[PDB]
Amino acid sequence: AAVAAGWHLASFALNLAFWGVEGMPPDRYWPTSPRIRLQIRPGRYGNMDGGQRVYMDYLARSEGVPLN
């Protein structure tokens, strides 16, 4: 059992050593927003003028803004 857990621990330590992006250049086949990559945009229906309001609070809850 010790060996079989040490394998996973080694993998986790390796993933820890990365820590982020510093060292990784930008890549053009893999932007950071999946909508650019997947070509997704709205249409004509399903767009109410009262939607942007709720949009904002979603934003406010994602960025951490506690006001709501």
Partner 1 sequence: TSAPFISPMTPYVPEEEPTRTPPSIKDTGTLRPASEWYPQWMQYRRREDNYVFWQDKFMRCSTDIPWAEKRWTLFSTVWYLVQQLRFVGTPPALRYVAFLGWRALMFQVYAAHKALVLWQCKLDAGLARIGSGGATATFSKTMALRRLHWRNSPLAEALYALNLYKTGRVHLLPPVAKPIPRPTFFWLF
Partner 2 sequence: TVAGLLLTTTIVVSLYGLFAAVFAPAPALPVAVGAWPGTAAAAAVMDGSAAGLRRLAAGGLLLTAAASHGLFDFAGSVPNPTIYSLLNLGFVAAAVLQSYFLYIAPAWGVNVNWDTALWGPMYGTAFLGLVYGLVALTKFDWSSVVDAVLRVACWFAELTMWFWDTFVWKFSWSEKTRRA
Q: Contact positions toward partner 2, by CB under 8 A?
A: 42-46
| Closest CB 15 distance from partner 1, rounded Å | 9
Alpha-carbon gap, residue 60 to 67, rounded angstroms: 8
From the list partner 1, partner 2, ligand DGD, none, pick the one residue 13 interacts with, judged by a Cβ distance below 5 to 8 Å according to partner type: ligand DGD
Number of residues written out for the chain? 68
Cα 49 from Cα 58, distance rounded (Å): 16
**In the chain, which ranges are E strands?**
none
Name which of residues 8 to 47 contact partner 1 (CB under 8 A): 14, 17-19, 22-24
Asked if residue 48 binds partner 1 (CB under 8 A), the reply is no
The 8-class DSSP code of residue 65 comes to -
Judged by the rule CB under 8 A, the positions of this chain that interact with partner 1 are 14, 17-19, 22-24
